[PDB]
Ligand binder design. Structure first.
Ligand SMILES: [Fe+3]
Ligand SMILES: [Fe+3]
Ligand SMILES: [Fe+3]
Ligand SMILES: [Fe+3]
Lengths: 202, 238, 238, 202, 238, 202, 238, 202
């Protein structure tokens, strides 16, 4: 029985290895980014944005974020997906981005995920798995993003209901809002203090 | 074989979130305990990266940024295996690394350390493990560097690494050090890890037989990720 | 003999209030330190319970809830002595216990563990120590059970117990385990206790000579409560 | 010199062994409860009620509470009482109850205690000793309940004055209030955060 | 590869036939020594059992006899590997097991122990090892039980097992116990085995990483059978 | 070099796991028994019966017996058989049974085995390998059953001749005898005392 | 207190019946194992002996047979306590002893050892333990003596003793030796006892503080008998 | 937990300390013997006699025997007797004797015991508990003597039925026989070999 390699903070320069462009380094021809929508990707395009705040309510300007989600039909572009359904052939399902050094805002251009099957024949409400890495953070923090215009589905969601402190459930619900013509979901993450975002051990 | 969930992460084999000795963790650590959940397809799945998207020099930090000459520093090769906790090899996992140069200077806008920049060194690379979980890259040995935790704090030489494998539950980022470095015993970041055996799990060992004469030295470093349990009775994953 | 106050509770021999490894303690632990007070009659007195209020089967968990048959499980007897820290026997103290059944299932509305319910087992009993501080009850050995601290957490087999004795300062609730159980070394709740010797103070020992042939096994478990100091000079209690 | 047996949490099912009825278990003919007033008990009847809140201001729905108090004349129904006075022969002085699984409210039907002698010839203001047990609580928390309509006595109380942080003294004073015709004292316990209730090591 | 005979059984790694401490062996043990013979086809061959004769629940002691509900007791999974003494996996070997219920009561006409019967538990199962010599079954942890050797004798919790593999010379029947059980050090039957290391070869180890959250615990137990030597010169087997 | 797993007695209830039917337990649809003859099995049917006696000449009422034998042509239904001959496709060659709880008698309905090749080009006389398991027996006892109407073959048998105490050879020879029309071989096993049956370490 | 049965005799703490090193045991030892039975009133009861039947010198081997003078030899006093295995004193138990004289010669028709007879020594005495289980007698220290096991066999100095107490199950006969005697390590009879700790349980220790100046030396020797278990539930004894 | 003092053989001269008279030593005024019948003892007088044989069928001439039995009504002259019945005030219930140095015969003059209650409300057949001590015997051997003219009671006796080897039960039954006018029961004890007497671990 081997033990898992121990985690360490990503450190302040986590952008050199994970987002060379943002560090002004051009070594890779194909760079990974925060845009999960391709030409023929199916589903309604949405923009996910927000900020991450520390214990002083100050945004982290050196944080790195990644998301993992299913396609428009709730199927993951992964061999581990055992649904038997065909996945959108034009969807990676993953993306990475960093907050702005100045303002602290982060965002992803993606698609709204479809409902995914839960354990024991249940159905999970639409969600996006998100992880946070940064200086001061020893282990990547896991969380989930749900959508407020999906209230009926959230009320029945297994994971959200596994949080006995009902009042904390709302911290995982992003607020929809139509900008010019694009749909944007605002999701702010609070690491400490009041309205601290729920973090999971998955 | 029908796979079940990943084995539980042993919180005791990892640094806690709140570690007062590592100052920046005081305000960037949740006050509430993590909420453990039973896994679903969301946690056991992960993205796939095709190899033909990687350049030929993506795993060669000595040449992928070399412009007019070779970078200054210690030529070293680092290789090893990525396995899951049950000893199974991790195939086609994405391994990303980044480090400072031989002066301990990072090619990052926020680094003003007096240590000298190397016009021929970038400090980052990536690769995919093969079918045996094997990986290998070449680089310049990074130099230690000062940082402000306590005013005269110094990080031992290290290489940052990240892995994206078969399951999201496996997502991991860490750092490995070099055998013999004396700064290892004084580092506040490495000391956030509770046990001594786990601290040693982050040290790359000198692999003398794999040195390349009149060329490069070599270090061996293996990585262990969480593993999935096999199911033989009820299948409640879905 | 004129009695003074109970000796001070040694906070080092008990788990602290805040124990991050035991998750639910994070929000149910005071942030302020406990305020120590000098004792008064309020702290050195306690209620009295008459024996004739107890049924004949109150200390027999095998039969006090048996309806159509006997409960399923390991027939065991548990006995021992209750003494104060100065070795004096604790007479007529109220001892209350409760446990899960052989499946690790509690007869409680909030327990939905897949472990099977036993229609002939209740899981609770009570007794009064005799003049020598001796107690004894019979039961079915409880099975371990999963719980959600970290997702795959498991409590070793245990029996919950409570004591109300001569002084309110003595009020105590705890749990004892069974010698040899391997889950003991991994339990987050038992690890809230600082020292190893104190952790061992909660293990009931196999008492082979007191086994009853072709009937029941037996465990020995003693309990120590805080004790009062005798006064020989000024009497400031009142 | 023997060491005290170490404390452990009462756990979430602390009702099975201490309040079988509330767990729907009927094994004992005589069950202990939260009603300390008998037919011929002396003194003015009062009802003590409140809730226990966690660090999120949420009530504990699995907490267990016990109280210990003197009779109407400040004499404890205990052999350890050395006052030489005769105690009310119809008063146990102790009671146990659990919060409601749904609302979280707890209560006791008792009598208002008389003043008890303090150390060195002093006099303590009327009070009830109370202890809290529950999941997450490793050691029963001790506290005291005083009464607001007893301000003159509280000002001179030894224990309350042994709290140097004067502003915290008020957390131990229950507020009187006449319901239909019954006298009720509301006492809410806050385990963490602001206005955290004072806890003693007795 | 042309196979020769099985390696000689090491009589020192097994209990002798006559063991006075285990009373019933006094009259059921030969007085003459066993006559050793050179092996023939009779000894190196064995029967073959087709898988399609086994029901789907044959290796699930929790459900193969469940009628109105689930049996009462500790849900546990037991798995491991069957190898020959040379470390080669034993493929398609027939493994049969039988045990008592959680009360230590066997569903057998000759068992009148006061321990309670479970209407939903049978106590027996069977399986065939796969191509890697791997096996796995589910059950309720058996309770210890009294028996008449010396009047107050008690067997530690155990599971009886039998194997029929590739050669008749390999035929074996035994019992395995659970790590931590204190009755292990006092059992007369286990003590018929000479060495301490062999006694430990019968203890199933807690396999914590293979526990199934909120469901079942798991034990690891491997079995080693006699192995055949390869022949490279004369072939006198026939 | 690994050591063989140590043997332990089968115990008094060895029938629960090896003969559920005899224990009145019905969990398996297909149960293993003492009948090795199928519809199209070749060879002359025979019945093998006897009793097992302890050191007091008392039969064991809790013993379990198994046998292993070749088909009518001396070929084993086993891949390990290297004779190159085709085996009877309707013959398992193995059987299991238990003595009667009351009388102690055991029996098998089988076929008389043909001669099997011995070591170094020799020929073994027809025989059946038999093993005994029971309470009090720490290691299954191995023995062989030969037939008395096969005297010429037995005289030349390698195994029987490897017993230097000639007088003990007869303990391995069963006595034939025609019942109504069925051929029965009586084979009694004596574990201790006089005429103790020969046991092998194979 | 309602008493149950005596605790089981631990066969491992006693010599086996068959002990080839002690020759006469070869033909006087059963070949069958002892049949253990559950106790009845027959086993838990025993005879009562009134004190007024004992003479004043019954426990004084120096004077109870002295005719014309005092016996020749080492004046010694032997005392100790008789307790049950649970540490309870054994009250009014009958203790009978017998020994050889200072020459190692027994006053028995079958003893023709050349060691000289003492006309003033008998070699036997008896007593009843008091309420604390205490006993005390005076005697001459017995001399070792040759016997025919192996031709040159020698018994260390010893005193034979017998006890009849509260239960027939307690009936016991044995021998105790004197601290320092070198013949102890070579005695075949003492070696019939398996463990070393049990062998030491038969050695009387020099009790220097209880020597009587210019008179007698003293030895301390305690005896432990089987003890009864208390019953708190069913009473199946009758 | 203390261990029982280890047993040792009584040795060849066990008569010096337990039967001084037989050793020709007169130190005690009151000597213990093999005569349990006093002037006013109730019940029918009987004589118990026999011999003890070794593995060579030779009688032991140095053996010592003791017996323990109830009175004529099955009540033991012991405080440990919990029957509530009054015991014969003229009955010790115990006796000791030694075999004859020449012939090897031993005997006791006693009374035939009445039935004693067994465990769980059963009834034991009339019996006498007997113990053997002698050179070569490391631990006193325990056994029981039943009577053949009490066949109906023996068939129902709990202890005798706890012997699974039925054929050995008869070794514990003494044979009655009327001498001149006295009733004598012959009971021979065989320590080894055939018809070895059953010995108990009580
Ligand atoms: Fe760094
Ligand atoms: Fe519990
Ligand atoms: Fe068994
Ligand atoms: Fe002697």
């Amino acid at each position: 029985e081997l033990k898992e390699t121990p985690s360490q903070t990503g450190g302040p320069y986590v952008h050199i290895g994970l987002l060379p462009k943002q560090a002004n380094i051009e070594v890779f021809e194909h760079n990974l980014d925060n845009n999960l929508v391709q030409d023929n990707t199916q589903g309604q395009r949405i923009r996910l944005e927000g900020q991450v705040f520390d214990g002083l309510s100050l945004p982290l300007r050196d944080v790195l974020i990644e998301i993992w989600q299913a396609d428009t039909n709730g199927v993951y572009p992964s061999q581990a997906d055992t649904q038997g359904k065909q996945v959108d052939p034009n969807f990676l399902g993953w993306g990475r981005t960093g907050a702005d050094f100045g303002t602290g805002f982060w965002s992803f251009n993606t698609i709204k995920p479809g409902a995914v099957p839960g354990r024991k024949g249940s159905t999970q409400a639409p969600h996006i798995s998100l992880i946070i890495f940064a200086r001061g953070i020893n282990i990547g923090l896991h969380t989930r993003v749900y959508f407020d215009d999906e209230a009926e589905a959230n009320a029945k969601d297994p994971v959200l209901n596994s949080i006995e402190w009902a009042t904390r459930r709302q911290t995982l619900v992003a607020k929809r809002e139509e900008r010019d013509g694009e749909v944007v979901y605002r999701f702010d993450i609070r690491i400490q203090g009041e309205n601290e975002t729920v973090f999971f051990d998955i | 074989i029908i796979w079940g969930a990943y084995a539980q992460r042993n919180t005791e084999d990892h640094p806690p979130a709140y570690a007062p000795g590592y100052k920046t963790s005081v305000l960037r650590s949740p006050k509430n305990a993590l909420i453990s959940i039973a896994e679903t397809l969301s946690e056991v799945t992960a993205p796939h990266f095709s190899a033909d998207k990687f350049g030929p020099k993506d795993n060669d930090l000595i040449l992928n940024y070399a412009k007019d000459g070779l970078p200054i520093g210690e030529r070293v090769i680092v290789h090893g295996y990525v396995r899951d906790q049950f000893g199974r090899p991790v195939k086609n996992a994405l391994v990303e690394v980044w480090q400072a140069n031989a002066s301990g200077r990072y090619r990052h806008p926020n680094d003003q350390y007096i240590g000298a920049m190397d016009p021929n060194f970038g400090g980052c690379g990536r690769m995919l493990t093969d079918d045996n979980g094997y990986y290998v890259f070449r680089t310049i040995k990074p130099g230690p560097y000062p940082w402000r935790n306590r005013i005269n704090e110094w990080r031992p030489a290290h290489i940052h690494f990240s892995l994206i494998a078969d399951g999201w539950a496996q997502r991991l980022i860490s750092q490995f050090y070099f055998e013999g470095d004396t700064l290892i015993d004084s580092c506040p970041i490495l000391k956030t890890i509770p046990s001594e055996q786990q601290r040693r799990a982050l040290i790359a060992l000198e692999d003398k037989s794999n040195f390349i004469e009149a060329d490069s030295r070599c270090y061996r470093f293996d990585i262990t990720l969480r593993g999935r349990r096999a199911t033989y009775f009820e299948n409640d994953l879905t």
